[PDB]
Curated annotation (Swiss-Prot):
Example of a GO MF term: carbohydrate binding
Annotated SUPFAM superfamilies: Ricin B-like lectins
Record localization: Secreted
SMART domains: RICIN
Name of the protein described by the UniProt record: Main hemagglutinin component type C
Predominant location category: secreted
1-gamma repeats (start-end): 98-145
Residue numbers spanned by region Sugar-binding site 2: 253-276
Note: This protein can also be encoded on a prophage.
Cellular component terms per the entry's GO annotation: extracellular region
Keywords noted in UniProt: Hemagglutinin, Lectin, Repeat, Secreted, Virulence
Annotated source species: Clostridium botulinum C phage
Length: 283
């Protein structure tokens, strides 16, 4: 799959190459360690790419906004407040075939992140050992791919993304355990984004481009209007934003932030308010 590619603005589990069941974990306010995979937000990391530097920040997703930091001149690493230090940027360079990634410090590219036998991390000069290889696993792909899900607006705990009765228009509706409110989320390798298929009619969440900008269930198409970048909110892994591929500045949104049954769901310019936030759960 290309779903685990080192894309800007995606969120990952970072594992030692020798153990897919351990992940980089912010255990305290400052310390990181490899730990049993639990999927808490303190084990999830957003990549923020700096094009000028060709290097990334690696930000924990537990709400603290702390970033992986080499404690120069020492060999220790920590999570620290982002002060844009050169020691806080990392090159992420991938072996295409093995999928292993070296995490190389920007300030001193002689040094790479290393995991030790005792599960601690440090920086070190480069060897040929697997203790300097990491695997990256996109969190959302792991959790949601090929799953039957429901999507709740943050606006109200009992209003869900629903195909309207006897029309293709997609609206908010209270839960009634209906196939019109159940969505199969599937990653499309070609578009590198998701489709969401309504269980009732086997048609897909699609931006219908006119002055209304409604979403409707629509037949399978290669057109970008049917494809969605499902992401966590920038600093909240408990909520989702869905950006449409036709215009990735536009997102799944609730018309006028209304909560009434039948309220139109639309695609509108990103602002990131609660009307654009969605709670996705497996059925």
């Amino acid at each position: 799959t290309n779903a685990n590619d080192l894309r800007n603005n995606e969120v990952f589990f970072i594992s030692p190459s020798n153990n897919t069941n351990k992940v980089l974990d912010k255990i305290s306010q400052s310390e990181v360690k490899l730990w049993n995979k639990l999927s808490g937000a303190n084990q999830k990391w957003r990549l923020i790419y700096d094009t000028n530097k060709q290097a990334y920040k690696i930000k924990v997703m537990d709400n603290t906004s702390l970033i992986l930091t080499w404690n120069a001149p020492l060999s220790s690493v920590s999570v620290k407040t982002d002060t844009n230090g050169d020691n806080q940027y990392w090159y992420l360079l991938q072996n295409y075939i093995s999928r292993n990634v070296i995490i190389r410090n920007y300030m001193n590219p002689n040094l790479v992140l290393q995991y030790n036998i005792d599960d601690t991390l440090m920086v070190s000069t480069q060897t040929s050992s697997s203790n300097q290889f990491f695997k990256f696993s996109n969190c959302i792909y792991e959790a949601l791919n090929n799953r039957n899900c429901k999507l709740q607006t943050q606006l109200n705990s009992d209003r869900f993304l629903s195909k309207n009765l006897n029309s293709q228009i997609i609206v908010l509706w209270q839960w009634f355990d209906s196939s019109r409110q159940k969505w199969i989320i599937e990653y499309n390798e070609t578009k590198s984004a998701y489709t969401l298929k309504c269980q009732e009619n086997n048609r897909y969440l699609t931006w219908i481009q006119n002055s209304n900008n409604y979403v409707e269930t629509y037949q399978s198409t290669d057109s970008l209007i049917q494809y969605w970048n499902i992401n966590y909110l920038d600093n909240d892994a408990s909520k989702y934003i869905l950006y449409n591929l036709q215009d990735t500045n536009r997102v799944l949104d609730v018309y006028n932030s209304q909560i009434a049954n039948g309220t139109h769901v639309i695609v509108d310019s990103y602002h990131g308010n609660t009307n654009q936030q969605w709670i996705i759960n497996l059925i």
